[PDB]
RNA sequence: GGAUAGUGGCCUACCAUGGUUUCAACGGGUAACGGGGAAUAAGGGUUCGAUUCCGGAGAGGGAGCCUGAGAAACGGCUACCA
RNA sequence: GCGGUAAUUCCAGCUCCAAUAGCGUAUAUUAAAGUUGUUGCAGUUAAAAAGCUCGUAGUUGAACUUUGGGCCCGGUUGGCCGGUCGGAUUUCCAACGGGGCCUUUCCUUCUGGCUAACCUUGAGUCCUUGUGGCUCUUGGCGAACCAGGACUUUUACUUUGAAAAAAUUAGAGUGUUCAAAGCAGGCGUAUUGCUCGAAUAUAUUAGCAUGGAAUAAUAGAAUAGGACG
RNA sequence: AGGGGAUCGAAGAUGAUCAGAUACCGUCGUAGUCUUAACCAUAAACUAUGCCGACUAGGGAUCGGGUGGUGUUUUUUUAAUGACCCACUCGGCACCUUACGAGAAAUCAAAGUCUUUGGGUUCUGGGGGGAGUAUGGUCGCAAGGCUGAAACUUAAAGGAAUUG
């Protein structure tokens, strides 16, 4: 029969194998170990709110050839810093250094996106009024 | 082969197969009445003995084991019964 | 268990209100109670012949037996008047439609009526809480002695 | 060891059949066996057998003819509540129309058709198609 | 193959192999269906009468083919002790 | 098979499907009894009883023409020894092993087969325990089995 | 025996050495109140339930207690800590 | 994967597609996933058989112990007929089930209460040449369970049933104008009421109750310390 | 830790080669190689393939045991033997041909009798790196053994076969 024992009262071993082989799904370890909370710059959320230190020009892997605006972010509730990109050509000129940007993820479980090495995080907002509305021309950035 | 008598083999094939692998299992040794004429009475024996038979009164001899059927001795009749 | 000088105690052992008047010379010494626990267990001699004072035994004193009975294989008989037996069931794990050995062991008071030792088959009776742990009480022997007799010496 | 001889006499009836032999000899004929055996000729999926009689277990001899596709075992004789006995012949019955699933119930060992008349369950014990 | 009021639903009821019974299904080119003639009176092969035998790939690949025919001609009357049903 | 090898012999005892007679047997089941408890009183084994009487005699099995095993009729008679004759030439041969062994320290290759027969004498006694022909407490100690054979 | 509305190592005194565990005790974790239930639709499953109903627990954290049929109550009191 | 000068991916115009009072993104989870595999995985070389053997816990474990034959009772579909003013039951027939019998055959067991059924029969007979038919007391059925005494090898499984909250789910009835819902409502003499409802199912482990006695365990009579009276 | 220390020879020293040459080749030669007493527990410790049981296919070799003989040879006087020959049957190590069958293939009488998916049972694996690393436990005189993560990173790594 290949191993698994096919006995009528073997349910226990059966249960408890299933038990330990779980550990090797990749994603079974993480909720149990609370990755998110113990890792993860957000806290297990959807987004997180932050601070720009500084502006950096993030020049992207190969085989691109460019320079990734990006930001990093010192997150409110963490402490944590995070280099996070800022999409959309132009942009870099709404974030402006000290600001408070709302990070989200990159939409890949982790796993840094593209061309641009090691940024897990991308920007949604600034100052409150929504990156996209900016580049638009929807809103414009508040006082200071 | 593909169509045949599991029922009823022949009695050769049956003959020459494994004592365990006939169609009922059985024994194919056998025993014997042995005597040297030197006495009136007969001594029944196995086929495999394993032990050296020694008859009724004299301390003579039968018989000498080996891998299978027992060597009978000097000069002796025998008949499977 | 008890075995042998009954009044073995600092406080005198007597059946509560059961009472022998000595200005009447009686021969059997002891005006003794008893009662049938019902569901057709026999209350068995030995607690109306004995002089036993258990007052938890289900037959000679004040406790009954209502609810559950259950019955179990004898365990350990190291404690005074009191056992403990396990019983075993299979438990279904329906993912995989196979069963699984497990086990409870349940402490139980035992009255001196009977004389127990590990291996037996019992049945017990709930009764009230008897002590910290104790809820049932041991009612009848389905066992004798497991094969005890015929285990001696050479023939 | 040896370990379900209901499993042995199966298998050499499918490999009987697959290797377009017409009898088998089958070791080493228990009860079961035969109440196995019997509900497959009932249905027309093998033709006589005979009980032959060492002073043992027992020796059958099968006579097959070509309706057998195949005939299975259930290894743990799993426990079938009536409401579950058309869950266990959907998953390994060809169809609805033909083949048996065969159980073994208090009532005997019968095929869920039977078992689903006489309104009586139990263990499952193997199929026939 | 019905169907409700009895009439006959899918075409094409197959052949079958006389020693296995099993299917002759339509890519199986490698079966066979020996043609016997019908022998009368002093010779003379009647043609146009046949004791036809059918066998599927599967038996003359294994090799049956032969002895199968041998038990199958006998039976059916066109062999005299060749076979045998005993080994 | 072959529990502590890896050996898969097939060599058995094919025994006759005639249950009754051989029928150009004579002497009765007196005959027979009174032959096997002779040799039990020499000391014979009940197999070595069962192979002097297979070969100098017409015993085929003492089971047909008597009713009752050789074993079981040397209980009867009160000669039954005090442990199993396999558990015993189990213990027998491990003490002759052992006394191998303890004379050189150097053959790994007897310490070895010292376990599995110890190992088959430990699982034989289990048995014997649970079926009562054993005190429920009777264990196979080396320092007493050379006392408990010869 | 005391205490309780009452059973009970609930507490005390005396005596005994017991009680649980690889059929996982004991300990750790839980970003754990339990359940009716929720999401996902071949089936078998997987994941979730703080939250309309039921049960429990709490009232800044502990402890104590008055009244009373019922509270160890907090939109009652008393004490300490914050 | 596009972009380094004719960019089918960038920035726009134009045009076009998809869904549409909605549409994108992030995170989680479920399906796809037979990539957690009881159903249902793979392990020669792709990830994977402990160097080897013993071995306790665990899981697992050969075959055999009332089969086969006979009679009776009455059920539910389906047929060939319809007797009747869509549906009806007899006789004829299969077919598939249930109960109870006799075959050497515990049904726990005695002591009465009871009797429903006949070996009964006491008369005959409505009436088709009569075992088609039942009302019917005077010898003669136990089990159909009451209740009192005396006792009982153990289990697993399966059957049916009780015990069982509502909302939720599945689902019936009902034209909230539809529908999500709701548990309403529908009829008249709409001038002094008539009236259908507010179903059914699942409710699975355990516990209780009951039928079954295959499958799988357990216990018994071997120093006879056995079994009936 | 003793004894042994012929031989070959990790180390080291040399002669050469080389741009270099801490190496390959040559010389010397420490430890070692051998043994007793104790440790160590690892090998591509390999068949890279668990064990017990069943079934499914043809062929000729050989190993051990056994049965059959108006077989050959050893002549003594015919045997008995011993060796050899032929047929069989168990249990060996293998090989040959097939493929019904299986596999991604290479190939495989098991790696077959699996979507027609259940004989019993043990063990391990779940993309690639990180890494058999960190940490704790434990064994060891040491060297090290056993148990053994994660963060982060990454779209491949890999297998067999085909053409170049
Ligand atoms: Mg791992
Ligand atoms: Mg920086
Ligand atoms: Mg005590
Ligand atoms: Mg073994
Ligand atoms: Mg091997
Ligand atoms: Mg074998
Ligand atoms: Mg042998
Ligand atoms: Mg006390
Ligand atoms: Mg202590
Ligand atoms: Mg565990
Ligand atoms: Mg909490
Ligand atoms: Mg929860
Ligand atoms: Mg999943
Ligand atoms: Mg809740
Ligand atoms: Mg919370
Ligand atoms: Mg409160
Ligand atoms: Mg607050
Ligand atoms: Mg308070
Ligand atoms: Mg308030
Ligand atoms: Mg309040
Ligand atoms: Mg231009
Ligand atoms: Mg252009
Ligand atoms: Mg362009
Ligand atoms: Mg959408
Ligand atoms: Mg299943
Ligand atoms: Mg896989
Ligand atoms: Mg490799
Ligand atoms: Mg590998
Ligand atoms: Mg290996
Ligand atoms: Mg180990
Ligand atoms: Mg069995
Ligand atoms: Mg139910
Ligand atoms: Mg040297
Ligand atoms: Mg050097
Ligand atoms: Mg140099
Ligand atoms: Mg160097
Ligand atoms: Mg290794
Ligand atoms: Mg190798
Ligand atoms: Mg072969
Ligand atoms: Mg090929
Ligand atoms: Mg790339
Ligand atoms: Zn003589």
């Known amino acids: 029969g290949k191993g698994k024992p096919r006995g009528l009262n073997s349910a226990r071993k059966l249960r408890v194998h299933r038990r330990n082989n779980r550990w090797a799904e990749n994603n079974y370890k993480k909720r149990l170990l609370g990755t998110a909370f113990k890792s993860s710059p957000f806290g297990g959320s959807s987004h997180a709110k932050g601070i720009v230190l500084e502006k950096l020009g993030i020049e992207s892997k190969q085989p691109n050839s460019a320079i990734r605006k990006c930001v990093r972010v010192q997150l409110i509730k963490n402490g944590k810093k995070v280099t996070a990109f800022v999409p959309n050509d132009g942009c870099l000129n709404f974030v402006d250094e000290n600001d408070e940007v709302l990070l989200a993820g990159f939409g890949r479980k982790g796993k840094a996106k593209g061309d641009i090495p090691g940024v897990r995080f991308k920007v949604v907002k600034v100052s409150g009024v929504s990156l996209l509305a900016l580049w638009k021309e929807k809103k414009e950035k508040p006082r200071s | 082969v593909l169509v045949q008598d599991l029922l009823h083999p022949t009695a050769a094939s049956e003959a020459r197969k494994h004592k365990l692998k006939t169609l009922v299992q059985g024994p194919r040794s056998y025993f014997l009445d042995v005597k040297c004429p030197g006495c009136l009475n007969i001594t029944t024996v196995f086929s495999h003995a394993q032990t050296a038979v020694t008859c009724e009164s004299c301390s003579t001899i039968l018989c000498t084991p080996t891998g299978g059927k027992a060597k009978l001795s000097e000069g002796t009749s025998f008949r499977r019964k | 268990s008890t075995e042998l000088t009954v009044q073995s105690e600092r406080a005198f052992q007597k059946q509560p209100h059961i009472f022998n008047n000595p200005k009447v010379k009686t021969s059997k010494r002891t005006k003794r109670w008893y009662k049938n626990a019902g569901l057709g267990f026999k209350t068995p001699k030995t607690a109306i012949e004995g002089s036993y004072i258990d007052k938890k035994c289900p037959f000679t004193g004040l406790v009954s037996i209502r609810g559950k009975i259950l019955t179990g294989t004898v365990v350990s008989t190291k404690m005074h008047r009191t056992i403990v037996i396990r019983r075993a069931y299979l438990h279904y794990i329906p993912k995989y439609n196979r069963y699984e050995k497990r086990h409870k062991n349940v402490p139980v008071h035992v009255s001196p009526a009977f004389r127990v030792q590990v291996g037996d088959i019992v049945t017990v009776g709930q009764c009230r809480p008897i002590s910290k742990t104790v809820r049932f009480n041991v009612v009848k022997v389905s066992a004798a002695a497991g094969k005890a007799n015929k285990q001696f010496a050479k023939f | ?129 | 193959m019905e169907n409700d009021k009895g009439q006959l639903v899918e075409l094409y009821v197959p052949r079958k192999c006389s020693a296995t019974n099993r299917i002759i299904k339509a890519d199986d080119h490698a079966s066979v269906q020996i043609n016997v003639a019908k022998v009368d009176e002093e010779g003379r092969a009647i043609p146009g009468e046949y004791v036809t035998y059918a066998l599927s790939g599967y038996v003359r690949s294994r090799g049956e083919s032969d002895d199968s025919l041998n038990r199958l001609a006998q039976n059916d009357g066109l062999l005299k002790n060749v076979w045998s049903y005993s080994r | 098979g072959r529990m502590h090898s890896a050996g898969k012999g097939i060599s058995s005892s094919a025994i006759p499907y005639s249950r009754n007679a051989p029928a150009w047997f004579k002497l009765s089941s007196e005959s027979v009894i009174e032959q096997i408890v002779k040799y039990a009183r020499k000391g014979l084994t009940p197999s070595q009883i069962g192979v002097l009487l297979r070969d100098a005699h017409g015993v085929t099995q003492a089971r047909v023409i008597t009713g009752n095993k050789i074993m079981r009729i040397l209980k009867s008679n009160g000669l039954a020894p005090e442990i199993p004759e396999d558990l015993y030439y189990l213990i027998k041969k491990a003490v002759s092993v052992r006394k191998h062994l303890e004379r050189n320290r150097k053959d790994k290759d007897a310490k070895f087969r010292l376990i599995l027969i110890e190992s088959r004498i430990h699982r034989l006694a289990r048995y014997y325990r649970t079926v009562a022909v054993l005190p429920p407490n009777w264990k196979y100690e080396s320092a007493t089995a050379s006392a408990l054979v010869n």
């Open chain 4, 1 to 129: 060891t040896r370990s379900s001889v209901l499993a042995d006499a199966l298998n050499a009836i499918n490999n009987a059949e697959k290797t377009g032999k017409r009898q088998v000899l089958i070791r080493p004929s228990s009860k079961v066996i035969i109440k196995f055996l019997q509900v497959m000729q009932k249905h027309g999926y093998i033709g006589e057998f005979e009980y032959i009689d060492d002073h043992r277990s027992g020796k059958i001899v099968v006579q097959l003819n070509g309706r057998l596709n195949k005939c299975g075992v259930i290894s743990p004789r799993f426990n079938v509540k009536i409401g579950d006995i058309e869950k266990w012949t959907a998953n390994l019955l060809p169809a609805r129309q033909f083949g048996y699933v065969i159980l073994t119930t208090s009532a005997g060992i019968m095929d869920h058709e039977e078992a689903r008349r006489k309104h009586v369950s139990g263990k499952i014990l193997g199929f026939v198609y």
